[PDB]
Amino acid sequence: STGSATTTPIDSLDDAYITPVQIGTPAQTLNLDFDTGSSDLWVFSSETTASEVDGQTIYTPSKSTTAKLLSGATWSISYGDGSSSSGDVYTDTVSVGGLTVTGQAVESAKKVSSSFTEDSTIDGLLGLAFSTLNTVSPTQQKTFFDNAKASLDSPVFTADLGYHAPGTYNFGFIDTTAYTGSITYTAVSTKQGFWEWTSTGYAVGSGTFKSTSIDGIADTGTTLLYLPATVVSAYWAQVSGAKSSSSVGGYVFPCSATLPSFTFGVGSARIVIPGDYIDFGPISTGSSSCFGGIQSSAGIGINIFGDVALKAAFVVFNGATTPTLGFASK
Ligand SMILES: NCCOc1ccccc1
């Protein structure tokens, strides 16, 4: 089997991407944030504290003839940005782009933090990291991809995120029309539960490529590119007036600037992030200070190849017995 679904930016900045997902019988369609950095499929629901729902579409398990309470199971997750959610668990039929999994754990939120309440466009998250990170207790649950994998034509999914435009998540096949050149594959460590790999270096603009190993994660659920402070300083040094602002929380730059590109290495191959992808617009409405799309990972404990980086590539998440990642230009 295969599936193919379009993913759409939630706003003009590509802050996140939402993908429609069919849950239950008859189908209830919710727009979920596919997150290769976590491993829980959770949704706003009829159980979510009413004051914490503000415009999201909810899953109502009592209206699904295939929903079953997973008795005794609870979940609670805290994300790197400080957001969180928690609740109980149902199993139900879940379909993405024509690919159906029966008995998928659908984690129903009883509580969500303010950042989720405020994002009326995100009805929940669909985790695509390794199932070892799933938070369901006392019986850990499998991701949608883990449950689908044996049925898929090939045990892979691909992320093709758009810049200020829709893109695609495919399951079970590689669309050879969706990228240019060849796909370069690189090793993955699953020891932390992430799609963790090592980039071979970077360049700023037209500058020379610096060969240096950068361990980080391919994370569709993180907006920006978070890299070591040395690398980030070298980038922003090429932008007149750019500075790290403690009050804003990262590097800012004059909105009048033209940003240089940023290149990252995948083996001997190179992925070029155009400068415009690094512009996240005014820090507040009407400001002439703009927020940068490349930020330091120093306070995080891991480097994160988030959407800023991934949207410059066609990315293969290869879930074979030894997982790997593939990157192609597009
Ligand atoms: N990276 C996992 C958490 O992602 C989000 C997405 C939207 C709001 C808050 C957190």
Side-chain angles (χ1 to χ4, degrees), residues 1-62 64-67 69-109 112-141 143-190 192-242 244-330:
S1 62
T2 64
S4 181
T6 298
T7 193
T8 301
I10 64 165
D11 64 21
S12 64
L13 300 176
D14 297 347
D15 280 317
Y17 298 77
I18 51 173
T19 307
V21 176
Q22 282 70 49
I23 310 179
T25 309
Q28 301 178 39
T29 300
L30 274 66
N31 297 326
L32 307 186
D33 184 349
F34 284 23
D35 181 9
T36 63
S38 71
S39 306
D40 288 50
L41 192 175
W42 73 262
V43 297
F44 279 80
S45 75
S46 57
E47 302 179 331
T48 309
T49 301
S51 64
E52 296 179 351
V53 184
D54 184 15
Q56 295 82 9
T57 295
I58 61 166
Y59 169 58
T60 303
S62 65
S64 175
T65 57
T66 44
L69 178 72
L70 186 63
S71 182
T74 59
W75 62 280
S76 178
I77 194 161
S78 314
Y79 298 104
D81 73 323
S83 298
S84 64
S85 52
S86 61
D88 56 15
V89 187
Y90 294 81
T91 57
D92 209 340
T93 301
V94 171
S95 301
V96 176
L99 168 67
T100 298
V101 167
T102 58
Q104 174 64 47
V106 179
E107 301 174 34
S108 169
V112 304
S113 64
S114 61
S115 278
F116 291 119
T117 300
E118 291 160 7
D119 285 345
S120 64
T121 64
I122 293 174
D123 302 324
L125 268 62
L126 188 148
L128 294 167
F130 293 86
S131 293
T132 54
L133 294 179
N134 177 266
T135 77
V136 176
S137 179
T139 307
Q140 188 173 61
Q141 300 294 304
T143 70
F144 175 81
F145 177 56
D146 209 342
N147 282 323
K149 181 182 303 181
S151 303
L152 294 178
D153 291 357
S154 180
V156 305
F157 69 90
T158 64
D160 180 9
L161 302 179
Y163 167 66
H164 295 353
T168 304
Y169 281 102
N170 290 330
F171 293 82
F173 71 106
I174 287 158
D175 178 359
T176 59
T177 74
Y179 57 88
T180 63
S182 54
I183 306 179
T184 297
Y185 290 86
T186 196
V188 163
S189 172
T190 66
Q192 300 192 270
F194 301 122
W195 293 92
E196 186 172 2
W197 64 290
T198 303
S199 173
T200 50
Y202 69 98
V204 175
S206 56
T208 61
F209 185 85
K210 174 72 166 181
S211 291
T212 184
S213 292
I214 304 170
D215 180 293
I217 64 167
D219 185 2
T220 59
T222 290
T223 313
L224 306 184
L225 174 53
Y226 294 89
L227 292 174
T230 49
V231 178
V232 174
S233 180
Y235 178 82
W236 289 109
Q238 298 304 311
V239 179
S240 293
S244 184
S245 167
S246 56
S247 60
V248 175
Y251 281 88
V252 298
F253 68 93
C255 294
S256 59
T258 304
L259 295 179
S261 64
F262 184 88
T263 300
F264 64 94
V266 182
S268 58
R270 307 287 181 253
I271 299 297
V272 180
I273 305 171
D276 289 350
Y277 291 25
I278 299 160
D279 182 0
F280 279 74
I283 59 170
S284 299
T285 303
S287 179
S288 73
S289 290
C290 272
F291 198 67
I294 296 179
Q295 298 292 345
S296 178
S297 65
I300 298 179
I302 200 157
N303 300 305
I304 306 170
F305 292 86
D307 296 337
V308 164
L310 303 182
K311 77 178 68 175
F314 177 88
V315 188
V316 180
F317 295 79
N318 171 26
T321 303
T322 302
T324 66
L325 281 165
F327 293 82
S329 295
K330 66 186 184 191

